[PDB]
Design a protein around this ligand. Sequence first.
Ligand SMILES: Nc1ncnc2c1ncn2[C@@H]1O[C@H](CSCC[C@H](N)C(=O)O)[C@@H](O)[C@H]1O
Lengths: 276, 300
Amino acid sequence: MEYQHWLREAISQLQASESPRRDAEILLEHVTGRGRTFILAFGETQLTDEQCQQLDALLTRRRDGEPIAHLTGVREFWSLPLFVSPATLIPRPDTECLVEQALARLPEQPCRILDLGTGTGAIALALASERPDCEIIAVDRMPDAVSLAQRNAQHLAIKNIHILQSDWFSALAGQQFAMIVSNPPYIDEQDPHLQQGDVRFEPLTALVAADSGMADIVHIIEQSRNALVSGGFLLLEHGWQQGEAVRQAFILAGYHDVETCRDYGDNERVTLGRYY
Amino acid sequence: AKLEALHERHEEVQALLGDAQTIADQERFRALSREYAQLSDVSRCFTDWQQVQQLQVLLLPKDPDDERNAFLEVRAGTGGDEAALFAGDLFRMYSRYAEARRWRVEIMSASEGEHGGYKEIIAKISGDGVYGRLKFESGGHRVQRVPATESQGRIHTSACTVAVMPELPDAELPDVNPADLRIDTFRSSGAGGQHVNTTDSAIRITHLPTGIVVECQDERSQHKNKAKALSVLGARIHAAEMAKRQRRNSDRNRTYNFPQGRVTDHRINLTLYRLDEVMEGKLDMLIEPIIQEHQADQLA
Ligand SMILES: Nc1ncnc2c1ncn2[C@@H]1O[C@H](CSCC[C@H](N)C(=O)O)[C@@H](O)[C@H]1O
């Protein structure tokens, strides 16, 4: 069959998507290993049988809603290539913001950073990348997340990062970092989003927090205290609506210099405080 | 008796330079030495019109960005969804051409035709001597075809616009980005973060001052699209202090008529009965001429 043909076909039976052509083009690229432009400039190309069959399986999934990054297994974050899997979350663009705000605060002097619920290793990696003079430490509860994280770390060649498997701080028993970053689960067990989107195929282990999606964020700002160096920062990502909320637990818990930066979707994504 | 004035200056400067190049010298003997490598061809000729088709020395009107890589975008205008459809054709034609001579063509933003085309589409072509070779392609391109969405067979005139900026070493960019710019999101709205996950990220950047607008979207990291966008804003900026400079080859540049199969560069009164060829990637039976042409203009 023809690249141009397949693309035409798939896009059809893929209308329920928010980006059919793209979904299409990506898949076709993935299988054939030819870029977007090629596919566009040369739709006369035939597909070897395999390709057509391989393209087929992946397509069914995607009709059942399975995320694209789940099908191709990769995701870029901070211009850094991360392997992802339904073992954790697919690193989001807004999360890049957390990282941005955290890069400023970081002390001009080499230091140690902690990443709670690192997941794929997104945040931790991007940082240990920017600050090769700092020792970051990413921990995760699910044992599989720990591995994807280590797998990325290897593939990426970043060595000033260290992955562990604690439940928030258990394994950290006795350490204090300059800055503590964390995008924990902050979705309500029953937010209508869980209902729709690729987010149907993502784990609750990483999606749902308790107390109406606020359980973890708080338990962390609480814990974080006993682990931050003098005036070190603690910054968390949260839901678009948990703006004022998170701000308070931050003040109530006793955090100096509270603040709430906004991402490019002009939502409220990162809340950052300090401590003494 | 006028241009010879030039030679009797160069032949002079070369002689002058060929000397310093024989004294105890280090450092930037590079800049100076290189000049010699230049004044040498121009000089070797004058020293003959004197020692003697006297090949009119065309070695005088220098150029700049010519070799730099280039950004190229196709915009849809006049005509219904017909035009965006030709945005496609045009863009293929270029990429089909950029490949024939192994250039790196890479998209950085696309606008799916409301029915199968491109409102926008902007590639980043790469290879040596790019800009100085597609610049002329800037301007307006007009089609007169008989749409497949028509059977009565009457031709339909639609048109597209084409911008062909230059690739500035992003390692040269003027860090034109304090707070003097507004980085926005395509998402007409959204909850973002965890709640939703789309297959690709789209950024947008507006230059508060000059008001320039740039945007991008692909399956990659936001970090990348943005930074990618920063590079196009720059090329878009430098594309102002060039259009500032006042036959200086939308302004109908060409017209592509299929019932006739002809293509015509209004700009140089050249019409060729080779539309097939031009649509498949043969843009040299056109770029070449408008080139020698833009040449003679300079030879005055
Ligand atoms: N007690 C706990 N300790 C460590 N990680 C935990 C945890 N409870 C939940 N998590 C982790 O919380 C993460 C939420 S999603 C974090 C994703 C990450 N920012 C990215 O961009 O990929 C999941 O990886 C989940 O395994």
